[PDB]
């Protein structure tokens, strides 16, 4: 059991293990498109003294954090141990090697989407975004008098084939991702893959349509088996006008009973309707997980709430360093210190605070985050909050 | 169709309409217990020129708001129009009379639980608390090393018959309600009713048991039909130690597959487990609705986040007044002004901000709340936040 | 295996066999109420050379047929063979004895409700009424502008406890039953039983309520398990105004999603709504079965459509006689003849024609009814039609 | 928002709107086959000042009405408003233009199949045929001794590939459609489309088979997911012998549990079985909707029951004219008059009477049809009845 970077000859073995580990696997032709996002030493395989029994890699990503600040981000992905090689510390060995490489390459954070919710905490990954599914029973939905864009004259929203308005979608998404914490740069090859899955497959998914606003779009398709359900795969709006306009159009799908979307806890949609209850939360789950690789770099890089006044504390991350943390005018200075710690937490907890989706108060109540001063707890809660709500870009 | 206060002779007609309007109706014997909470002119009936075709009333309640401040609260309840008398403006007439009386009596707020989510917005009621159902698959649940009270020696939690530890339950709840926004004083007659429903009914609910900590308790029962599901009817914990200890005991119900609880969005339970995903959100809904009766009284009465610095604005409530609002050192002065408004909202929106469960940002995005300054929006978000998360006491 | 009339000592054995044969069995106390409707030689038992292994009986009923004509009707009921004594010709022996007795007593027809739909055809019983279940999704239901009783002023319909308006229910039902083919006289002891089942049972059915119009009523209850479904057990309306008024009240049960009713194919309810499709047919089944005991007596007793002009034919019933049938001015003369038959059918088929629920055309297409003249077929179709649609009174 | 006849350049925009409005849409290649049935000014589009946001059209159809009389019929179809352009009166504008054109072209009736049951009443369309789904549990089904074609010697019914017996299917259907009210001429291009859908699709429907009698056929296929269910897509029989023979063959599909068919209320199948209950009604819905364009032309064109004697009345259609209606010897003369009206109804109601599927009595009970003489009501019921039961040809 040797741990190496793959050679050209290893990739057939890697695509076999992928096909057997992931039910959603998109085949080797399209794996080669995502493979353009893997840098030269971004991948490790385990061979059995010989076929591939383990693999892991990272993609080069750009993640927007609070303050509209963009971080080079190592996107962990394609992680699989053969079912013949479980309980052998293969994941621990592969994750340790990729973390060494990601850290030495100068990435301040790593990120992933978890197959199960109990694997990645022990490697310093913390859930950092929250997925909300809203199912609207659109037959009862009426917009509130206060809702934008419900007047006379022509609608600003168009029904279009996605594949004929690539540039407009790209330009809107680019604006959205630079502006929203959790935003990822979507490279050309992922726009290739998104629009390939927009077309109907024989005995697969149905044709995807788009609703296009100057400042927003929604891609949607009728569900395979439930023909009265429309699944919004993606809705990016840069302005409230665009969000409302697009949802007026979705509520206008008169042959559907229900519209479903994976969105975020702070989606305003419920407040657009006379009956907020018509936007039911059907499903909730962790989205993006963050491992903070360099604590001072990550803490210094993001913006903090201007509302909370200047304050200083000593943060200890477990086997991750101790820092004099000073926050004021929405910036942080984070410096080495050996002063007594006032707040302690494992690396994963910091991940979960970092994009503003979890409150330090909530993690303190669970004793994931220890302090004896509850004034500092209120101050952390306020400081680490994002004025713009954290959202989830795309799964990788 | 006359609108009067009921006389002794009207109450049979009112209990008939109740039996036909509410499936959960607990019968006349026990309606007489809740009736002790209705003050002398707290009820209106509509007679048909004659039987009761409409009724509404309010109970005298005490509601904890941010800053551990307790408000006299008119609890709207027992609202019903006969199915023979729909679309007759009977609800509008009854709600208008009770609002006159509640306002003239000197109640700063009114509150209710909604049968549907689209009735009460137009009367100035806004959803002010959020119910989260968590279903734990307790077979996979392991507590995190960081979780409190997982050491050697005896457990501090006891399994008990609820009916033999009334005083301890009362004393813990009393501590909980004074300390948590959304807290209600539970009077003796509701403790009578809670413990009556704790016993097994023939072809009804199963025996309720209690888990009792010095600083917390949980009442739970196995579900009627799903014999592998335990339903936590109520869990009140004053300290994190008590919350964790009680959940260790619930995860210890080894004959159950699943533990379900109606709790709040900031419940730390997920963070107590190695796999946060094991506490799935099965259900979300509006809890307590608030109508702010007197805007200056309510705004002045509650505490504000000490983190945000002093600031002034002009708030207009639609057909509800305009005020110079000044917030600093966690207090507010709210005075009459005719200065140009900087922030406008309907009365219901203020209800939804008032306990901290909804962010002004989120309601602005839906245009339920209008301003042109986004600095003020951030400042409102921060000011109206509760350091202690808002919870839901009991349905009425 | 002897076939006798029961003695007082046989009735315990009969109530045991009833308890084991019928899941709906209402116990011996209430069996004694129905037993008042059994005449002195109306019952047969089979003993095993000794316990009761077979029973059958008939109740004295009054059945309204087309022309508002009321027939003494032998209501077959309480038919059961022990599971230990199947495939022994016990049903054939019991049915043959009761038919002898019913015929010699001077009953023109016998009637029953069938447990299965393939037992009773071979004994000359034909399905004579049709049960339609309509489920209304009442959340979408709006009454058509043309619908009666949708103006200003007070509703003529009252919500009441059934048990306090017995006389009004009795008087309306009495008007309904005299006026509608399929109508049965409901004796005092069945009004006793109907109102006993109107009250809530522990771990049984919920409280029944009534909607009372001067010319109509509806008894309804929320379903045991589906708390958003209201089950109309019975709706008797003498005038269209009453039918519409009562359905406006049912659509007004705002806490229900769905209203369900067992009614008849010609129920006007769909035509009262802007969307006829909202009254979905969830279920259809045979109601009352008729065996014509005396062909000339039954054919002469009922009224015929005045529209079709005078005509004569020769009807043969298989092992039931041949008759010169002459119909004109809505009356029939039916006399013995040996003239060549023009129309042949088994006794059961005549049962199915007799109340107007099945068309001779439809039974001819299946060759249940043979003729060579299709002019006569059109003439039978028209003659045997009821101007008032055939309905189902109550199960026995 | 301009309302024009489409040009060649509009049809891509129309096929896009079709793909997004109809889940069953059969793609542009096959839309071009149906397009042969659209006459030169049979289509209208709405452009947004520019893409297609609305469309409607009519196909040239031939509809058999009572008396085996065939009417030129404008078949409304391909009606869609963009979800971006709802609540804009676009359907009202398009329906008004097509009605002008259909009326000026000299069509006596228009017809459609409704997506929802509450859209088309207000445009004068009334439900005119009824769809019954029968599901037979064929494991219990035995044919009655009276059923045709159950003797010795060879079966007259053959199992065949549909695609090899096109001419026989065409010739039987042509006989069926000329003979049955609701019958439509099926043109060559719809026979092309029917047989294309007869073949197995990858991850779609299974191979269709045919049962072929000299005077009848059935096309059937096993259901995609329920492999014990056979779905009869279509069964056309000209003689009772053919109907019975074909159903003996269907009951002979020994590897199926259940046979399902969309048929009509008067299908004799139940009466072919010893247990009529084995043919359960699983589903009921409106089929063909009729708008009577010219009242005197339509009323004069169809045959009336010869049974009812000559009579005269004055019919008023709401904003549709008043007529002296005289019916005798199965013909009607319908002439302009200003004499006082004896019977009033909206245009849609006449639609529903016209093919005999709804009784004037039933529509009177709902007050959709007003008269003060109930003798005339009985006379209308009888006159407008079809001796041959009304059936549904094919959806368009
Ligand atoms: C070598 C190259 C590296 C990454 C990679 C491929 S295919 C490919 N497909 C996807 S799409 C599904 C994402 C959801 N995912 C599913 C399981 C749970 C986590 C979230 N993503 C990639 N990163 C790659 C090959
Ligand atoms: C006169 C007296 C006034 C209030 C009152 C009774 S019984 C009684 N039972 C209850 S328990 C169910 C609460 C849930 N509720 C159910 C429907 C939706 C709203 C929330 N509550 C009361 N306030 C009273 C009679
Ligand atoms: C001796 C006396 C004779 C008839 C009789 C009893 S209980 C009693 N309960 C009923 S209620 C259920 C009717 C539905 N029925 C259920 C099975 C299928 C047929 C339809 N009816 C009776 N005739 C009697 C005892
Ligand atoms: C231009 C041409 C006009 C009519 C037309 C096409 S495709 C095409 N497909 C069909 S098949 C489905 C009928 C069911 N229908 C489905 C929705 C509800 C109503 C009933 N029918 C057409 N008339 C056309 C294009």
Curated annotation (Swiss-Prot), chains A, B, C, D:
One of its GO terms (cellular component) is host extracellular space. One of its GO terms (biological process) is symbiont-mediated suppression of host programmed cell death. CDD domains: NAT_SF. It is an enzyme of class 2 (transferase). Keywords: Acyltransferase, Antibiotic resistance, Host cytoplasmic vesicle, Secreted, Transferase. Residues 1-148 form the N-acetyltransferase domain. It catalyses: L-lysyl-[protein] + acetyl-CoA = N(6)-acetyl-L-lysyl-[protein] + CoA + H(+). It is found in: Secreted; Host cytoplasmic vesicle, Host phagosome; Extracellular vesicle, Bacterial extracellular vesicle; Host extracellular space. Acetyl-CoA binds at residues 79-81, 87-92, 115-116. It comes from the Bacteria. Its EC number is 2.3.1.-. Disruption phenotype: No significant difference in terms of intracellular survival in U-397 macrophages and in an in vivo mouse aerosol model of infection. A strain lacking this gene induces more TNF-alpha but less IL-10 production in primary human monocytes than wild-type. Macrophages infected with a M.tuberculosis eis-deletion mutant display markedly increased accumulation of massive autophagic vacuoles and formation of autophagosomes in vitro and in vivo. The active site is at residues 120, 396. Is potently inhibited by several small-molecules that share an isothiazole S,S-dioxide heterocyclic core. Some of these inhibitors, when used in combination with KAN against resistant M.tuberculosis, efficiently overcome Eis-mediated KAN resistance by restoring the antibacterial activity of KAN. Some of these compounds also inhibit in vitro acetylation of DNA-binding protein HupB. GO terms for molecular function: aminoglycoside N-acetyltransferase activity; identical protein binding; N-acetyltransferase activity; protein-lysine-acetyltransferase activity. Belongs to the acetyltransferase Eis family. Increased expression of eis due to point mutations in the promoter region of eis is responsible for resistance to the second-line injectable drug kanamycin in a number of M.tuberculosis clinical isolates, through acetylation of its amino groups, which leads to inactivation of the drug. The Eis monomer consists of three regions that are assembled into a heart-shaped molecule. This shape is formed by an unusual fusion of two general control non-derepressible 5 (GCN5)-related N-acetyltransferase (GNAT) regions and a C-terminal region. The N-acetyltransferase domain of Eis is responsible for its modulation of ROS generation and pro-inflammatory responses in macrophages. Effector that is released into the host cell and affects host immune responses; it negatively modulates inflammation, macrophage autophagy, and cell death through redox-dependent signaling. Acts as an acetyltransferase. Acetylates 'Lys-55' of dual-specificity protein phosphatase 16 (DUSP16)/mitogen-activated protein kinase phosphatase-7 (MKP-7), a JNK-specific phosphatase; this leads to the inhibition of JNK-dependent autophagy, phagosome maturation, and ROS (reactive oxygen species) generation for enhanced intracellular survival of M.tuberculosis. Can also acetylate multiple amine groups of many aminoglycoside (AG) antibiotics, leading to their inactivation, and thus contributes to drug resistance. Is also able to acetylate and deactivate the cyclic peptide antibiotic capreomycin, but not the other anti-tuberculous drugs isoniazid and pyrazinamide. Acetylates kanamycin (KAN) more efficiently than amikacin (AMK), even though Eis seems to bind AMK with higher affinity. Does not acetylate and inactivate streptomycin, apramycin and spectinomycin. This is N-acetyltransferase Eis. The lineage of its organism: Bacteria, Bacillati, Actinomycetota, Actinomycetes, Mycobacteriales. The gene is eis.
């Amino acid at each position: 059991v040797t741990l190496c970077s793959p050679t050209e000859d290893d990739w057939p073995g890697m695509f076999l293990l992928a096909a057997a580990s992931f039910t959603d696997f998109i085949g080797p032709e399209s794996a080669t498109a995502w493979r353009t996002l893997v840098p030269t030493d971004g991948a490790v395989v385990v061979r059995d003294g010989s076929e591939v029994v383990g693999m892991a890699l990272y993609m080069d990503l750009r993640l927007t954090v609070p303050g509209e600040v963009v971080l080079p981000t190592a996107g962990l992905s394609f992680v699989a141990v053969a079912p013949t090689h479980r309980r052998r510390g293969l994941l621990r060995a592969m994750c340790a090697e990729l973390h060494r490489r990601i850290a030495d390459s100068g990435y301040p954070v790593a990120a992933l989407h978890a197959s199960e919710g109990g694997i990645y905490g022990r490697f310093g990954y913390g859930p950092a975004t929250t997925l909300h599914e809203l199912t609207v029973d659109r037959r009862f939905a009426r917009f509130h008098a206060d809702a934008p864009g419900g007047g006379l004259g022509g609608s600003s929203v168009r029904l279009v084939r996605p594949t004929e308005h690539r540039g407009e979608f790209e330009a809107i998404y680019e604006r959205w991702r630079q502006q929203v914490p959790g935003g990822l740069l979507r490279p050309q090859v992922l726009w290739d893959e998104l629009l390939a899955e927009a077309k109907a497959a024989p005995g697969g998914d149905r044709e995807s349509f788009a609703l296009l606003h100057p400042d927003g779009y929604a891609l949607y398709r009728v569900d395979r088996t439930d023909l009265k359900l429309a699944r919004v795969s993606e809705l990016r709006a840069v302005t409230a006008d665009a969000h409302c306009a697009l949802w007026r159009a979705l509520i206008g799908l008169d042959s559907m009973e229900r519209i479903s979307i994976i969105t975020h806890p702070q989606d305003p949609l419920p407040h657009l309707l006379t009956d907020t209850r018509l936007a039911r939360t059907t499903w909730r789950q962790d989205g993006l997980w963050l491992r903070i690789m360099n604590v001072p770099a990550a803490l210094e890089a993001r913006g903090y709430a201007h509302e909370v006044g200047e304050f200083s504390t000593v943060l200890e991350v477990s086997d991750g360093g101790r820092f004099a943390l000073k926050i004021g005018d929405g910036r942080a200075r984070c410096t080495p210190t050996d002063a007594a710690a006032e707040i302690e937490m494992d690396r994963d907890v910091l991940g979960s605070l970092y994009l503003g989706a979890h409150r330090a108060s909530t993690l303190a109540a669970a004793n994931r985050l220890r302090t004896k001063d509850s004034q500092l707890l209120r101050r952390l809660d306020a400081a680490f909050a994002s004025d713009v709500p954290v959202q989830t870009a795309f799964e990788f």
